[PDB]
């Protein structure tokens, strides 16, 4: 009933891309966009696309274009959304968010022409000259936007124009053309590939000339005779003009004065196309899903299907006409969904499936390709299984929670891969100790490798020597007669400085250089040849290296209006602080922040209310700790990390015009909090990674690589962490070093198999073949993966009534072959993720795997009930004229003696059962040791004997059951169209029954079980980007008696869902039902009580109205059921997360408008973040 949907992984996989101004007219930016999320990329020089701004939308971007308005200093964006929504937005300076200029709601019942079901996506096009912009609405209406700086739009009825266009394969604006001429591909008589005897070819082109002022539309240059299968059209640029029209088999160039020139590509235009086509020599290929763009003029780079890249050269004569075409075979790449030229020589290849990457091309007319840094992508997650990691250390083995990570079949085709995803970092502990009484810690470098480990007790000071064998130091140096507040290197890892409350001891090694005595000290900062020392009463003293190496006192000239609470120091290796330069940060107790220039001592930056959390700061309670650090390539972008009233809130920095030309922007979180010890501990080069470790009740690794993307990684194993230090040794590599709450020092190294640059730490495992399914086998601890391969088809099965007869395909040598898929079942080892050799079940010639699950049949061999087999249902696709029959394949992993030299070969499949069934096998399950198979319209529940399956009980179900699950003798089933038939198997009598079903027809991807204390929900994802929970309620009267199900919660997720997990709680008995969305991300459903629900439903109705959302959108109407009667009961936890982002000056205003204190809602929201910290 009552639940909440949270997003754990942000969705990856880019659909759209362009190269326009975003920040300023001076530089250019790659602007890519995926499912409801916008990314802006700069480019540093190897070249590595650096992230600059990431933006989260409450919609599903359906088109994107950019046109630069006159007078503006930037370039706007035109974001097309679902159910006809255009939104002109711009980047904003000042506040770093992106501003919204215009909204245009075009959803009208009289525009859809009676068509309820919307098939066509809205398409935005803009002029090359930047005169007007156009949107194709619903496949019929054209909206024209003339170029406050806007002009009011007008809708063109296309079927009211000439020639009765009636369709829209593609539409572009042409070049030249003082009036903004719009070209339109269409089909007046639409036809279908596979029916070409009665409709040979019908595609046409109308180039319409738009008058803005007169609002009349004359048709010029109609063609009418194009081939039947034309995909996208491309506007040829200005010095040549015209248009190239990609067909599936042919390629055309079209111009208004030149006669039509068109060539065929593969010999398939024999009996289908009567358009006059030549024969392109050399070339042999098909353009059916191709993405292409122009290098400056007369050169076009085409990314085909199969990832292959060609460079088409338009051979130009003296008349600026086209003689012929030239095709060359350049390097192959990722299966793209986009294509963009960047400046001169750089190409971007945006792809949903596969890693979208950056190319470099130079001449060699003929080009060669070099691959720059790619963007990591979790692709279309088809099936994913929850497994257990292998090398978790023995120090952490006694943790009470389960320790588990997920394995995701991502990508498709040549980019097919397994993705091993994981939340919080599990460190490898190589050496542990027990050192009681000491709480602070430091590691300094004494002459790369860390020399001294310095511990501060309450009474004395421990010093440890590192090296070959780490051992406690006994000699003079650091004063062990008291505690030490902080110890750090000065200079460049040459001279060591510690500070006790009494004085500031220098040190060069084993020998103290000199001593300088200074209210009790609390903290000091010694970063970058300047040492600033602060006592408890608010006194501040500064030191400095003076080589003649002796530090002199230079107390800052300050006029204290209130007491200084905390400090920080920072300098600019690659700095934006303009007006290596040193900066002092100082926070007073009145509530202000004051950034100081450090060699002199003048006020540069001033915030009136530094506590609270105001979202964007500008110049002119009880702050604990404040740290400015730089993170990224060459220490480029700085971050402000503060500690205010048990609440972490961190700030970025961005340039904005005698003061600092910077302002600070707040970024969201998932982290919560519940002498002076430092909690914000900056580390450089731990496993090559620079960043911050954040100590507290929930530790979090803060990482920024050269990508520039902020990465927060928790660490939930081994409890809360008191202190931390970077550590580099001989027997320990580049690593780290922390205390436990129970007082155990742990030498540690990060595990090397993961990659922490991604939002979750993930190891991407390339298969170079399409991963369909994956199944963790609990016994013997391996993964079973069904994969494919693309082989050319050569035979055609026929059914003559007596036997099967294959027909050999015999065509010309200039002919492309159809794709036959041969499936095989891999076996992946979690120890090292290489596939296990000599363990592969290869299927038949035409056979396709429809399902793989880990099915626990019952056996009298084990002392438990179950064994946990791997069962695969699979059938043969040989065309519609051949009867489809299937085969149930039950496999078990058996440990054998290993082959010498190969320790991974101890595991191997043994097939218990392989028999061809009577019909197709579509889905498999398990019910108390019974295998539940769905053949045709029947759902047999087999039973496993010694060697064979024996049937017990079936029913007659609906059309094509493709998903089934079951929980304690109750099966749920999922049709393509009838969507639900939940079953029940009585034990004693061998009978299976139908309890209830969804009476409405509905498309279904996959099903799940929402679990509460007593309420068992039936979660369904449904092809329309929704989620819905059906319950079986016989006492209710709006359902019929025990026959009809009722949906109780409706929620429009942005993306498709195939996978479903259940994890326990950490919420007496309610399971979290996880899912990984098909457009990249991973989501949650957490059931709640009604009392906690309606305090937050009053919050969401306040958060929807009173906040300026991105692209002027409605967060309510986006999360309303379908399309884009509804019974909504799922909260938007991505909108409730913007309650945490508000300042607690503004947090209390919404709490008074809904009638509570802000401290209750923070108790309500942060329990959701605490219990969902699995994986």
């Amino acid at each position: 009933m009552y639940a909440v949907y949270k997003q754990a992984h942000p969705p990856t996989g880019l659909e759209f891309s362009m190269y326009c101004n975003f920040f300023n007219n001076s530089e250019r930016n790659l602007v890519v966009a995926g499912t409801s999320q916008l990314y802006v990329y700069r480019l540093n020089r190897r070249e590595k696309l650096e992230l600059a701004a990431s933006f989260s939308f409450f919609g599903n971007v359906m088109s994107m274009a950019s046109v630069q308005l006159a007078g503006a200093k930037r370039d706007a964006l035109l974001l097309s959304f679902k159910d006809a929504k255009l939104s002109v937005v711009e980047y904003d300076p000042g506040t770093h968010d992106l501003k919204t200029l215009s909204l245009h709601y075009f959803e009208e019942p009289e525009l859809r022409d009676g068509f309820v079901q919307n098939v066509h996506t809205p398409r935005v096009r803009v002029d090359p000259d930047g005169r007007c912009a156009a949107m194709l609405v619903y496949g019929t209406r054209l909206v024209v936007l003339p170029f406050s700086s806007f002009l009011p739009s007008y809708i063109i009825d296309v079927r009211a124009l000439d020639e009765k266009l009636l369709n829209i394969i593609d539409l572009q604006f042409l070049h030249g053309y003082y009036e903004p001429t719009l070209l339109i591909l269409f089909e007046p008589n639409q036809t279908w590939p596979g029916r070409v005897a009665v409709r040979q070819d019908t595609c046409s082109i109308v180039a319409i000339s738009l008058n803005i002022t007169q609002k009349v539309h004359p048709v010029i240059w109609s063609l009418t005779s194009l081939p039947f299968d034309c995909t996208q059209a491309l506007a040829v640029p200005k010095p040549i003009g015209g248009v190239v029209v990609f067909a599936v088999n042919s390629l055309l160039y079209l111009n208004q004065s030149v006669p039509p020139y068109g060539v065929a590509l593969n010999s398939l235009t024999t009996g289908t196309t009567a358009f006059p086509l030549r024969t392109q020599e050399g070339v042999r290929i098909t353009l059916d899903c191709a993405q292409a763009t122009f290098i400056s003029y007369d050169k076009m780079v085409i990314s085909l299907k199969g990832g292959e890249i060609y460079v088409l050269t338009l051979i130009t004569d003296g008349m600026r006409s086209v003689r012929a075409f030239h095709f060359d075979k350049a390097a192959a790449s990722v299966l793209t969904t986009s294509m963009v030229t960047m400046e001169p020589g750089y190409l971007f290849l945006g792809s949903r499936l596969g890693n979208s990457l950056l190319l470099k091309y130079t001449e060699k007319a003929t080009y060669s390709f070099e691959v720059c840094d790619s963007i990591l992508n979790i692709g279309p997650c088809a099936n994913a299984a929850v497994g257990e990691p292998a090398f978790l250390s023995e120090e952490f083995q006694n943790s009470p929670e389960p320790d588990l990570e997920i394995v995701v079949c991502s990508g498709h085709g040549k980019n097919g891969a397994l993705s091993v995803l994981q939340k919080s970092i599990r460190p490898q502990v190589v050496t542990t100790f027990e050192l009681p009484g000491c709480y602070d810690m430091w590691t300094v470098i004494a002459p790369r490798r860390h020399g001294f480990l310095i511990l501060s007790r309450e009474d004395s000071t421990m010093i440890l020597q590192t090296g070959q064998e780490i051992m406690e130091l006994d000699t003079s140096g650091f004063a062990t007669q008291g505690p030490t507040v902080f110890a750090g290197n000065i200079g460049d890892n040459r001279y060591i400085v510690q500070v006790s409350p009494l004085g500031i001891r220098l040190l060069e090694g084993v020998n103290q250089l000199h001593f300088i005595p200074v209210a009790p000290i609390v903290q000091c900062a010694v970063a970058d040849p300047y040492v600033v020392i602060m006592s408890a009463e608010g006194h501040v003293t500064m030191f400095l290296l003076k080589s003649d190496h002796r530090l002199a006192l230079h107390k800052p000239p300050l006029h204290h209006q209130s007491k200084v609470i905390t400090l920080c120091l920072y300098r600019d290796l690659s700095g934006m602080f303009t007006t290596p330069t040193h900066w002092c940060l100082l926070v007073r107790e009145n509530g202000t922040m004051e950034i100081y220039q450090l060699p002199d001592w003048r006020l540069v930056f001033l915030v009136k209310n530094f506590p609270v959390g105001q979202r964007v700061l500008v110049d002119s309670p009880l702050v604990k700790e404040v740290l400015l650090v730089a993170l990224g390539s060459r220490q480029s972008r700085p971050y402000l990390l503060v500690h205010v009233d048990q609440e972490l809130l961190i700030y970025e920095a961005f340039p904005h015009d005698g003061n600092l030309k910077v302002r600070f922007k707040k970024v969201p979180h998932n982290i919560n909090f519940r002498g002076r010890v430092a909690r914000f501990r900056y580390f450089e080069d731990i496993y090559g990674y620079s960043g911050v470790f954040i100590c507290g009740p929930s530790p979090h690794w803060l990482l920024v690589t050269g990508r520039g993307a902020l990465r927060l990684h928790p660490m939930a194993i081994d409890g809360p962490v008191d202190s931390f230090a970077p550590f580099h040794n001989v027997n320990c590599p580049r690593g780290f070093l922390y205390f436990n709450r129970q007082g155990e020092l742990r030498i540690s190294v990060l595990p090397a198999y993961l990659s922490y640059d991604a939002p979750w730490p993930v190891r991407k495992i390339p298969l170079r073949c399409t991963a369909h399914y994956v199944a963790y086998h609990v016994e013997s601890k391996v993964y079973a993966v069904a994969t494919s391969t693309n082989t050319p088809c050569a035979r055609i099965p026929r059914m003559t009534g007596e036997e099967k007869e294959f027909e050999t395909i015999e065509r010309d040598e200039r002919y492309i072959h159809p794709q036959q898929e041969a499936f095989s079942i891999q076996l992946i080892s979690p120890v090292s993720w290489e596939a296990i050799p000599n363990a592969r079940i290869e299927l038949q010639e035409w056979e396709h795997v429809t399902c793989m699950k880990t099915v626990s049949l019952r056996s009298e061999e084990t002392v438990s009930g179950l064994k946990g087999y791997v069962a695969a249902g699979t059938c043969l696709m040989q065309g519609e004229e051949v009867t489809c029959r299937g085969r149930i394949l039950i496999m078990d992993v058996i440990e054998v003696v290993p082959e010498p030299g190969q320790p991974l070969t101890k595991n191997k499949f043994k097939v218990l059962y392989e028999k061809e069934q009577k019909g197709p096998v579509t889905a498999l399950c398990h019910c108390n040791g019974h295998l539940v198979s769905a053949i045709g319209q029947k759902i047999f529940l087999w039973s496993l004997r010694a060697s064979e399956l024996t049937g017990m009980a079936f029913i007659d179900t609906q059309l094509y059951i493709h998903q089934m699950i079951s929980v304690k003798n109750f099966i749920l089933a999922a049709d393509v169209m009838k969507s639900i038939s939940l079953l029940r198997y009585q034990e004693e009598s061998k009978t299976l029954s139908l309890v209830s079903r969804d009476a409405k027809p509905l498309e279904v991807y996959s099903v799940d079980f929402m679990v509460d204390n007593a309420q068992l929900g039936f979660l369904v994802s449904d092809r329309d980007r929704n989620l819905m929970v059906y319950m079986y309620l016989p006492e209710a009267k709006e359902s019929f008696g025990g026959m009809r199900l009722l949906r109780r919660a409706d929620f429009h997720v942005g993306a498709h869902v195939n996978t479903f997990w259940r994890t326990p709680c950490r919420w007496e008995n309610k399971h979290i039902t996880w899912f990984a969305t098909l457009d990249g991300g991973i989501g949650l459903l957490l059931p709640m009580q009604e009392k906690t629900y309606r305090r937050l439903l009053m919050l969401q109705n306040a958060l929807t109205t009173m906040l300026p959302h991105h692209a002027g959108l409605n967060p309510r109407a986006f999360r309303m059921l379908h399309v884009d009667n509804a019974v909504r009961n799922v909260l938007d936890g991505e909108l409730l997360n913007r309650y945490l982002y508000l300042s607690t000056m503004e947090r209390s205003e919404l709490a008074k408008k809904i009638g509570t204190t802000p401290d209750i809602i923070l108790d309500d929201l942060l329990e959701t973040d605490r219990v969902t910290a699995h994986f």
């Binding site: 639409q190 009665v198 969904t337 059309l959």
Partner: protein, 363 residues
């Protein structure tokens, strides 16, 4: 022979994953080697002609050779039941069309036949006036008499509670389901009424006629009030159907025409459908492709239409012998059936890629 929908759906489920839309789909290329790449309707949703069936499969004929009137699919698609003039239900198989069984239902020619919204019941009428309920295992359930004159068309409410039977005495009587109770009679129609369709949401009853003065009457099920009169044809509206979306009224009459009507706007008129050289007497909408429908004829013409195109998409002239009474698509839109006016019944499935249409039909 066979037409198995299983390799199309599995190819759709493997293409379900990595396809964002239909604009991402790899195009089926017209050769006999691209047979695996066919997906059903619901997959290749735009490009509605798809599934415009004109490939012949089999002519399912009985031994007794009686002319058939109503043919409808079982809603799980397992089997075609067929109503003939001798009151016999001949159940035809759904993939290998050979034979399943012959019932004997009525003592009259079987006129109307409809299945429930769920898989539970099947309403069947006859030329005598009796209305029987039928379980999914084809067991006879309680019977009664609805009309004194032959019942020509039936159809029930958007729930299993209430049906309406129209007959040749001119009355459209609205019935309860469980109690078999005659709720009220819809009189004032002018002459004998031959078609009735309930609205899928709003609760309307739209009736045709043979009378030219009152050809189409919108009715109310809750009251007895005639909602709106809509004279639209010259003579004898044969069939009246409604989309599953509920916006459109499609009408077939004896004046060689089919007309679309918007029930929200009865003053104006949407497009008309010529080309039937004889009367159009069997209109049947397509279940998954809203805005296209099949249309039969009395000379045997089979024509396929689409909303927005002035001409027809494609079809068959003088192919099917005799009349055509009724058509029923499979719950997946791949195969179509028809009740011929002779003593046969022909099955039509979409054209394969790469074949040349050189047979007796089409070309």
């Amino acid at each position: 022979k066979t037409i198995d929908y299983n390799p199309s759906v599995i190819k759709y489920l493997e293409n379900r994953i990595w396809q964002r839309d239909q604009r991402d789909m790899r195009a089926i290329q017209p050769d006999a080697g691209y047979y695996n790449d066919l997906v059903p309707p619901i997959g290749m949703l735009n490009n509605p002609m798809n599934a415009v069936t004109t490939k012949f499969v089999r002519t399912s004929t009985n031994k007794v050779k009686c002319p058939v009137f109503v043919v409808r699919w079982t809603p799980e698609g397992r089997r075609l039941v067929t109503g003939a003039s001798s009151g016999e239900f001949t159940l035809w198989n759904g993939l290998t069309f050979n034979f399943e069984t012959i019932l004997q239902a009525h003592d009259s020619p079987v006129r109307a036949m409809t299945w429930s919204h769920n898989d539970m019941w099947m309403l069947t009428a006859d030329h005598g006036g009796y209305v029987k309920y039928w379980q999914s295992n084809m067991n006879n359930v309680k019977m009664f008499q609805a009309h004194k004159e032959a019942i020509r068309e039936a159809s029930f409410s958007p729930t299993d509670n209430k049906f309406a039977t129209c007959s040749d005495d001119g009355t459209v009587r609205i019935w309860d389901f469980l109690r078999c109770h005659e709720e009220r009679i819809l009189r004032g129609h002018g002459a004998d009424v031959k078609c009735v369709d309930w609205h899928p949401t709003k609760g309307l009853v739209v009736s045709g006629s043979k009378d030219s003065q009152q050809p189409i009457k919108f009715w109310d099920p809750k009251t007895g009030q005639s909602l709106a009169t809509l004279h639209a044809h010259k003579n004898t509206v044969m069939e009246v159907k409604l989309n599953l979306n509920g916006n459109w009224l499609l009408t077939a009459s004896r004046d060689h025409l089919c007309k679309l009507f918007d029930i929200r706007n009865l003053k104006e008129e949407l497009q008309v459908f010529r080309g039937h050289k004889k009367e159009a007497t069997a209109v049947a909408w397509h279940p998954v492709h809203e805005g296209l429908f099949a249309s039969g004829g009395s000379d045997g013409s089979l024509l396929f239409w689409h909303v927005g195109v002035e001409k027809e998409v494609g079809g068959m002239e003088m192919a099917h012998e005799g009349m055509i009474w009724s058509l029923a698509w499979h719950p997946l839109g791949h195969i179509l059936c028809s009740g011929s006016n002779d003593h046969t019944s022909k099955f039509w499935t979409r054209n394969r890629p790469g074949d040349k249409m050189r047979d007796r039909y089409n070309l």
